[PDB]
């Protein structure tokens, strides 16, 4: 925003311009959504970024031979809050992105959900996003219980997976609640202290949605596009 | 039972003895069960039948060359009490075996159910048999809803159910409760006399059964082959 040389020349002057309005925001904002599990808001935006992320890249790529062929571009000389390193570093949320449809766009977000071992957010996708997939099949609706063709989408959704995927719901569920919670059965006693009930290992998760449950999705979906 | 002539050889006496005895009952038992839909009771007994029919079909072939070659014995000359045609049209009851697991015969017997024109009780195995379907897939269970195994193939089925064949449901249900009933809604008046809230319609219900729903369960039993 102050990065604003005291003279440069007319190259330089669209090229900082171009660079010192490009919506880092936008970015930022991208990262935030898919942290906090607003999966529909992360791929919608993912379009947004593709076009801010490819006009940061032609955005670089002039500033990289201007900097290659320093020798010309002297104003730059003595100028500091221009930083190459920050805006390249910005370019790889590139591998964030996918094209496609959002129901393939939010596909691909389960799959960066297993990569970072973001477990919550990667099991409530998983569990949710056949349901999608299911309404996608009967020609759409709205995620409510006031709509008919959700209504029983998720009934099967939910039934398929408490009869074979058992676990992928036991598991979303305790993680959704957390320790404190009817899901881990602890016990507060007269000290205040508290004594916890059910004990799932980091490794039963670990192993469970970085091995099986990609798997077990692919194997809910195929199921569901016979439906 | 009261068949039993003064004179006869040691051939006819083997013959007339193995027909005296032929558990007709049985045959009388397996159509009570099909007309009155205990489906699962009457596949259990397609095989005892199967034998019956069998020793029946050898019985008869004697009796036919007996016949045949009637000249030669003239000692059933005054019988009356034995009829060919009685035992003849009893071995027709083949026309209603098969062979194969207990939901491979009730396969069948819902084909039979649609060939004579007794819908309700094809809707109900049309209906119920896809649930059966599942059981067996995840290894087996009783058809009650203390069975978690059921519990959800039921929801799977009714949804699915409820989702796409819409119709199947809604005739299945008005079959069942009849005319009187909240599925017809009629109205009593003051009086004492009924006035229908729906229409029978005998030719959506003849026409939906016997054309469209074979192919509405084969369509079903496909899909739930992939749970």
């Given at each position: 925003?102050?990065?604003?040389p005291?003279?440069?020349?007319e190259?330089e002057?669209?090229?900082?311009?171009?660079?010192?309005?490009?919506?880092?925001?936008v970015?930022?904002?991208?990262?935030?959504?898919?942290?906090?599990?607003f999966?529909?808001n992360?791929?919608?935006?993912?379009?947004e970024?593709?076009?801010?992320?490819?006009?940061?890249?032609?955005?670089?790529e002039?500033?990289?031979?201007?900097?290659?062929?320093w020798?010309?571009?002297?104003?730059?000389?003595?100028?500091?809050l221009?930083?190459?390193?920050?805006?390249?570093?910005?370019?790889?949320?590139?591998?964030?992105?996918?094209?496609?449809?959002d129901?393939?766009?939010?596909?691909?977000?389960?799959?960066?959900?297993?990569?970072?071992?973001?477990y919550?957010?990667a099991?409530?996708?998983?569990?949710?996003?056949?349901?999608?997939?299911?309404?996608?099949?009967?020609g759409?609706?709205?995620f409510?219980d006031?709509?008919?063709?959700?209504?029983?989408?998720?009934?099967i959704?939910?039934?398929?997976?408490?009869?074979?995927?058992?676990?992928l719901?036991?598991?979303?569920?305790?993680?959704?609640?957390?320790?404190?919670?009817?899901?881990m059965?602890?016990?507060?006693?007269?000290?205040?202290?508290?004594?916890p009930?059910?004990?799932?290992?980091?490794?039963k998760?670990?192993?469970?949605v970085?091995?099986?449950?990609?798997?077990?999705?692919?194997?809910?979906?195929?199921?569901?596009?016979?439906?």
């Open positions: 925003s102050r990065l604003n005291t003279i440069f020349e190259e002057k669209k090229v900082l311009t171009r660079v010192k309005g490009t919506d880092v925001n970015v930022i904002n991208f990262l935030w959504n898919i942290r906090n599990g999966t529909v992360a791929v919608k935006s993912m379009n970024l593709k076009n801010i992320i490819n006009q940061l890249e032609e955005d670089l002039k500033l990289k031979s201007f900097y290659k062929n020798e010309e571009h002297k104003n730059f000389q003595g100028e500091t221009l930083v190459l390193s920050d805006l390249d570093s910005t370019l790889k949320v590139k591998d964030l992105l996918i094209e496609g449809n129901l393939e766009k939010l596909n691909y977000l389960l799959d960066l959900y297993i990569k970072a071992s973001i919550d957010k099991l409530s996708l998983a569990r949710e996003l056949p349901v999608a997939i299911c309404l996608n099949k009967v759409g609706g709205m409510d006031k709509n008919e063709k959700y209504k029983h989408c998720n009934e959704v939910t039934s398929y997976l408490r009869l074979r995927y058992s676990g719901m036991e598991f979303r569920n305790t993680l959704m609640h957390g320790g404190l919670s009817t899901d059965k602890p016990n507060v006693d007269k000290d205040g202290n508290i004594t009930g059910k004990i799932v290992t980091k490794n998760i670990e192993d469970f970085k091995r099986e449950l990609r798997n077990y999705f692919d194997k809910i979906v195929n199921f569901l596009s016979s439906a």
